[PDB]
């Protein structure tokens, strides 16, 4: 009697919870192979200047990680030569030539001290003279904002995962002969397979301000989750998109994202460059995937564990 | 009697299957630390032009992901200025100046509309005038094929994995004083430790056409699997190379791989650029590794589980 | 009696080892989401030349993988044209025009053979003439060492991990209003949250020589481990930094790390370039993370397994 009832209870528990909920009856491959091919579109304008994708999207190869430049501090006509050192560099400020010694090379400085003391770019102060790429950015840079139309920029993310154990492959764009991808807007439900995202949409879904992230910069992750149950039709294994900032926002020291790159020229045989400090939004496309398909081995093993505890549950009910 | 036979059967099952097949007696580290150092070699020629690795391999730092450019659509002598808008842009075509309004900036366009209507690059049509990088690519581009000798290109992939738990490190190139790496060709068996692959070989092993992948572009994965059994000599833990396309081929919208980059110049003090749209093959080197080494803890734990079910198997044989 | 003692022993074993040591009572997420924002600082000087971060740090976007150039072999004034082929290329050396045939394009060569035989850059030898980027590097390159002050370079690594299951996020820089990050030096204990590392410090902690790694090049991994116990205060989940070389050092063929990039100019309307072969140290920032937080489900399941073997341990003590 109670032995039979205990049998029924222990069985029901095992069957239902373990198999139907923990999916103990399926072999699982956590971590697929993914390809991410990103393409940004959108043009923005500064003072008498039109910026295109080639200028703000760095790197340009169209991969999982890329930065959209929203603000630049550019120093033009830089050449090897002597110029006053940045006033922000330690021991820069000087009152006479005796206050600067020749040959010091601060790692945080902008060149090799010449031993002299020259007037600063903006008087009346004076700073130690250095040899290097001149003029220095902190005395000759001009700032441009090119993120006025960045929220209207778009980012097509092409993702294709693979499960080698299960030989399953699925992408995030459907095979449609119509011009869907040319006239579609991503939606979690209606347009899940239109992976074209507005930058403003991504920023909002991450709960951030576009003014703050366009001024200081930062990193937003585009997370794609493929939680696939391969015992069901492939129409069931769809992408899940999540947008969240990956860099700190409450920490003033670690908040922001900027980098420096230069464009090199040759004017009258002399190598000149334009140094650009770029504050922008780094977009990181993170792809997570877990797939499970029914296999007889896990089934038999976990059924054996189920019968095993059924037994002990019965013998303790006696004991 | 039958209790003894049941004991023998249950034991044999546990010992053989669990330990000898599931490797329950080994602690396993899934996912090593890998370094991938790729170097492409090969020169290809266009009309009165020889292309080298620096031109087609982008990025050039020699990492796990890189693109080999097989076809380019290059627009030369681009400068900020006014030019007819691409006829492919919406609302571009115009019949009089009244049909174009000043100040509109389409994100999918190529600049800021001037309010005028000018003759197109190829008559007799007319398109709205825009300010931006001019002339636009869709009216001044010239196409070059530089993949004629890409199948003969070679890709040296240097891989070195590490298992921190097991303090095991192995690379895919052997310590040989002879000039093996200068005269060797990869083979799955005879030359497994000559990781120099022809691009045509990679493309064929992926089951793709080099004409199709040289015209549209795409992504091929070079997957290296290190399934190491560290209870055996290190000579046993070798790489396994797999080649397969990672981007869709049956989906016209998501099929292909292209990117745009530019070369910037300064002619008479004016910043001019050459815009290049590059169709190429992206090579992705994916490294998978699983290692196991015998440990006493898993051994004792799984032996305890083995004896545990031996028991229940015996008590149910009674019951 | 002995049944009671056996009960006590089996229980103590299960409780202590399994829960208190194996953490069977916690759900665990292996592998977080991490953002790495690297910024190198430091200037180095060659013969009448000051190198800055923009010149040696490639790529410059500030990511997990980047290379610091310590030595360059630069070939200047390269243009499409005819020049002697490198003597190191097979079948290059020639004694008369009949020894070179027109049209051959060696993949390991530097251009298309013209059919002629011209004097080499350094006599008295002669080599087959080729068309391509000329002059070739092996006959016109000049070597510069720019790693004299690389050990004094610094690398700020900003890391922020996330556990989506546990909704936990922590970074490696603390929220301090003082100028700590401007005056701090990393220390495993006192300054764990000052993620600014000297390159020499990284190289030493990897057990390498800076002379050897500055001459040949190589790859050093900066591994950050976040082993977090989320049942404890967040002040307990701190980073663990490990430095180790990822590329082989005992294998002459696979030892080193170099890449080629070029700077393109236009002199008198002709596209000229400077080809640079860069030997440098590739810094790879690898982030590992494992987190566990107490959950009732694993607790009940593993407690059931504990009682299960307690039983069998008891029935075998009888049997
Ligand atoms: N960032 C984007 N926003 C909106 N639409 C895009 C974006 N990137 C690409 N597309 C469109 O979606 C399709 C996929 O782009 P893809 O690069 O594969 O083809 P394409 O037509 O060669 O690209 P392009 O638009 O540069 O010519 C193309 O039709 C393209 O116009
Ligand atoms: N893509 C490739 N195909 C064939 N052989 C290669 C390739 N890349 C490198 N090698 C050869 O294999 C060895 C490894 O190249 P590595 O870059 O480590 O040394 P290297 O001699 O300095 O390279 P390089 O050939 O540019 O001088 C070198 O001898 C090089 O000639
Ligand atoms: N490699 C480095 N070595 C030492 N200090 C650094 C390094 N990189 C950045 N810092 C300092 O630590 C802080 C973090 O740098 P971050 O780029 O976030 O801000 P920043 O002040 O805009 O950088 P920058 O120093 O280029 O102006 C800044 O105060 C910066 O001066
Ligand atoms: C440079 O800085 C140090 C430390 O503050 C200071 O002692 C020294 O006097 C400074 N240099 C000169 C020439 O004043
Ligand atoms: C995109 O542009 C429209 C105007 O065409 C504007 O209303 C909208 O706010 C823009 N998107 C932003 C800024 O999020
Ligand atoms: C621009 O496109 C819209 C939508 O097709 C159309 O209504 C409008 O008339 C077009 N512009 C002009 C000036 O025709
Ligand atoms: C490589 O070149 C040879 C001729 O030297 C040619 O026969 C072969 O087909 C090429 N490889 C390709 C195109 O796969
Ligand atoms: C080119 O190399 C091959 C192989 O060594 C050799 O047989 C041939 O004679 C060489 N070319 C000439 C013209 O000598
Ligand atoms: C950094 O510079 C100091 C001198 O200012 C020198 O003593 C030290 O050795 C350098 N770091 C190196 C080379 O590791």
Numbering used by the authors:
A (entry chain B), B (entry chain A), C (entry chain C): 43 to 361
Question: What text does the study give?
Answer:
The P2X2 receptor (P2X2R) is an adenosine triphosphate (ATP)-gated ion channel with few small-molecule modulators that exhibit poor pharmacological properties. It is known to be involved in the auditory system and has been proposed as a drug target for age- and noise-related hearing loss. Each P2X2 protomer is composed of intracellular N and C termini and two transmembrane (TM) helices (outer TM1 and pore-lining TM2) connected by a voluminous extracellular domain. Three P2X2 protomers intertwine to form the trimeric receptor, with each subunit adopting a dolphin-like shape, as first established for the zebrafish P2X4R (zfP2X4R).
Using cryo-EM we determined two distinct structures (obtained from two different purification approaches) with ATP bound in the orthosteric binding sites and a uniquely constricted pore, consistent with desensitized state conformations. Both desensitized state structures, which we refer to as conformation I and conformation II, were determined at high resolution (2.5 Å, and 2.6 Å, respectively). In conformation II, the left flipper (residues 288–299) adopts an alternate pose compared to conformation I, abrogating an interaction with ATP. In contrast, in conformation II, the loop containing S296 is flipped away from the orthosteric pocket, resulting in S296 pointing in the opposite direction, now at a distance of 8.0 Å from the α-phosphate of ATP. As a result of this alternate conformation, there is one less interaction with ATP and a larger opening to the ATP-binding pocket. During cryo-EM data processing from the second purification, we were able to classify two distinct conformational states; the apo closed state conformation in addition to the alternate ATP-bound desensitized state conformation II, which has not been described before. We speculate that the adjusted purification conditions (depletion of ATP using apyrase and addition of Ca2+-ions) allowed us to capture both conformations. Finally, when conformation II was used for MD simulations, the left flipper starts in an “open pocket” conformation, with an initial distance between S296 and the α-phosphate of ATP of 8.0 Å. The left flipper of conformation II was also mobile during the simulations moving between distances above and below 4.0 Å for the aforementioned interaction (S19 D–F). Thus, we speculate that conformation II captures the receptor in a transitionary state where the movement of the loop might facilitate release of ATP from the orthosteric pocket in the desensitized state of hP2X2R.
